[model samples]
Target: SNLVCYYDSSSYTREGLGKLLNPDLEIALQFCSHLVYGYAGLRGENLQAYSMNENLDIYKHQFSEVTSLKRKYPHLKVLLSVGGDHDIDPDHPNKYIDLLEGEKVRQIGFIRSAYELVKTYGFDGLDLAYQFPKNKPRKVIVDPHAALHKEQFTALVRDVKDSLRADGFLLSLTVLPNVNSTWYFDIPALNGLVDFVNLATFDFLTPARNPEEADYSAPIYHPDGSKDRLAHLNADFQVEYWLSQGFPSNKINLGVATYGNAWKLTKDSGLEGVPVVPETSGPAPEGFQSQKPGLLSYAEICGKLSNPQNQFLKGNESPLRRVSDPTKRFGGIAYRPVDGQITEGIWVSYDDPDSASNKAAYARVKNLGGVALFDLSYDDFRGQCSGDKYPILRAIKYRL
Candidate 1:
């Protein structure tokens, strides 16, 4: 089914219940056909793959521990992923750009090093997860050089594919969801070069990215399709766009997020329905264990939902209300109200088992390879809600 699950090595360092989050190999391996370990960083000197974890020795040792699982779950294919958003050397923002800028010698060295890294760790393949050529400028600085490097990026992929093919090793790439034509990827040029591509369909709308209005983090479709320009920012549109570009649907693994984007409502009153249009001031307060404002894990959100006080118009008359989009375009939203006037409270856009099921079903109907979870640990691994751990993942698998 190509149900891929990504395990972030740094998740173990999170505080509180997050401390309990680990790569539950035995449990997750049962559900996933492939597991991707993220992320190996590129060495500035050689552009080779290396552990991003500060505790190098521990991470190195854990590499063998993760691969060793294949002995038990023979069907499992584990790939080592390199280059994430934070994996880049902050001091040199153009680190990846330097590699992709028509340097054949450096590019060949990188391919060799990546192949060596995979073999050293006994991984099935290597997954390139780098965010290159800046799809969207970070803040004020718009990089004029981003668009110029697209062909170089394609050439690198071709070279890497050739190198990996010699040893029968697999190759995959993680790409941003294309909301517009201003993307760095040349999708048609990349066809058949890699085994698969993981489409990061989440984070289409985030508090930090889109501060003007709060919206669902990963909607299947735009809730208000009347807004023509905004309609492209959705999972269905992303899949259709990739297909339109000649990318094979069977090699596309749609990403499903286990976390939520949150916001602080300016006026929480009269927010008891779908398309909750209450003006939002900014991101919501940091969630428990997550400790990040405007973000919450399925575990944290489910924990809050379990509390009797959070129910809508029920027990203790708690102000928190859970609302699902009647149109089924978006996931669910949880908001709170204060006093009768209801001025200030938190609003969170999250996916429950129901929404996850919807996405998985969509992937199946579309004949996609499968659905990939951004991570496994972020889900309710503790059975916080419905006494079923990994409820979201299980729902996805069932629907698939």
Candidate 2:
């Protein structure tokens, strides 16, 4: 019930998604609750590394952009993420990552540098999203050669908090869901230091093959008897895990994606019984940022389904996919427009318009310590807000 109603925006989100700042904030104010001001890449010597440093000036660097919702919805709190799984290579682009990819001492140094760097930028907080420190084959740097990172991770967090205590900056951590607990490292210790922990609660399934009908977006930790079948996990269950582990319920922020995951339906849509599914390639589409084969942004997917012009690209569609469908063979519809994509998607994580309502609902219901927005820039929701009507500016608006 509680939600952060967050959006993920970054320089890329700005460039790639065609966003202007103030309208972006307006979207936030109009739609969801809380903002996860976005990502400044941790750093890489490559083309996009300036995000994390204050000197880079994302606002200025991309001067052509714009924000009014930010002013109107002053209650929204924006924060910075240290990494959005970028430049996570073991080669260690800079001293901070060099430490993250190597021996114990460097790991400690990485946090120190990160904290100092974060302060330099004048950010209100930090989101430590080391996307894949151990997931080697997945393009993430795997530290098989290094010491136990989980243990070191906690140490790093503790150190950052110690340093921040002097300066009074908020601290938060982005986490991979429980399907892989190893990623969290020392949960209790890390929890002790964080104001809240964001569960990167999407993507519970990864690609093992190519197909259109097999995918559907669902929760990674679904509670029993959940109304939604696609979801395997839900906010309540996720919080239960933290509570069981000694983390406070108030401190656990449920994860929500602004984007959507997808699965192509069979002609029958991937349902049971009547079997409308007539063999198909898969439910995913082909393109950039597509994790699963069929997955597409709401703008993309909705545009396709809604627009007759894009009909040629349509995947399997069975009108009867819902529980109310009279013909059992035609199952519910799926967003996936490709061969292999994450089943369910956080449309908001991918679509700010969709994110607006959920944020208000999630934050209030969860009784959360506070909503932890994914990042600041892209999700700024530039055009959506007309000023008093949206959810992001309502109820729990915040500022620092």
Candidate 3:
């Protein structure tokens, strides 16, 4: 089973688990077949440490720890991932906005610098992960209207591949899965440029500014058949779509989120279609990298589930209570609190071991390259299903 884990140098992960030890690194070595250090930024052609930690040196601590783990887990391949949702350059903050634009020499310069940075840090390869090009206009922008610059994207990949080919380093991409972004990708053309692609199969439903459209972060499948659009707005549908687009399943890796999205649903017959608004308190919890209300890590979610005050819908008890029909499939469950009223309560959409395990099995059945998690730390945090450990990680690994 090819299992890749994305480890961000932020949160509890950047440092150790308080006084005891480095829990994230410790847990990662135990299972991760490939560990992708979330980032090292690109300033023009130079690779810079992306974290804000005191030890700003990627070679000293960030890259060092991951490289050290390879001694014990010798087979572990640590890839230096470049570009995330907010990946920006210090010199030119909006560099990624036009990364593939400008002079071809600068493009190759960045690639060459990236190649040396990975080799110097002892990383096994590179994971190029630029989220999506924004649709808004800016002073300097590549494909500003977000047509995705199929030619530029293809050109960037080819240049990077050429630069690293001499060293025989591996290259992969963290892809955009949403339809809005998916349409921009020349799937078959891009697929051939890298070793494999990690499909960001979550975040299909983001927070709605309109406060009218409430949606889950990611759903495997929509139970309602007439609502086929709902089905299309899920991880499963995207995977099938990618396969249909001519990319081999073996070269595609499935990504699952260990987090959930929360929304403020109205009190009046608050069903999925009901008016969904933002929480007054905000989307993100107190201490999280993502301060957005729409995002919550598995650890934070598990804490909520463990609350005895919270109500759990075991069966098809009520139409409003169950989110992922329990009888039809073993998907994520939905719940509310006994003390809270339906109208005032905060609704959460998350994946548990049950749902995660099924997705992993689906990946296996499809003969995918492997299974990947956005952040291993999210899975490492206190979870209700796994007792004292990570059940989500174990579940997915088991299925794989």
Tens-place lDDT digits, model 2, residues 1-400? 2234443443333334434345444454443444444455544442222454343344554211222234555554444566655434466545343444456554545556656545665455666655543232121034553346566566667877877787777777777532334444566776778877776554443222223223222232342332233333344455555667777667766554433434344333433422123234444443343333544543333333434454443233311112212321111232332233323221111323323334434545656554443333323233222333332333334320
Model 1: per-residue Cα lDDT over 344-399, one tens digit each: 56667778888888888888888999988878777777677678878888989888
Model 1 / residue 15 / CA error / Å = 2.5
Question: For model 2, what is the error of residue 358's alpha carbon versus the real structure, in angstroms, after optimal superposition?
Answer: 7.3
**Global lDDT of each model?**
0.74, 0.44, 0.63
What is candidate 2's TM-score against the reference? Answer: 0.63
* Prediction 1 global C-alpha lDDT: 0.74
Q: Lowest-lDDT window of 10 residues in candidate 3?
A: 273-282
Misplaced by over 4 Å in model 1 are 20-23, 44-46, 54-60, 133-147, 177-182, 225-229, 268-279, 309-319, 338-344
The candidate maximizing lDDT is 1
Indicate the TM-score of model 3.
Answer: 0.80
Where does candidate 2 stray beyond 4 Å?
Answer: 1-17, 29-34, 43-76, 88-109, 133-147, 177-179, 206-213, 220-236, 263-283, 286-294, 306-367, 370-400
Error of 2 at 48 (Å): 14
Where is model 3 more than 4 Å wrong at Cα?
A: 12-21, 44-54, 57-59, 88-94, 134-148, 177-182, 208-211, 222-231, 266-292, 306-322, 327-333, 337-344, 382-386
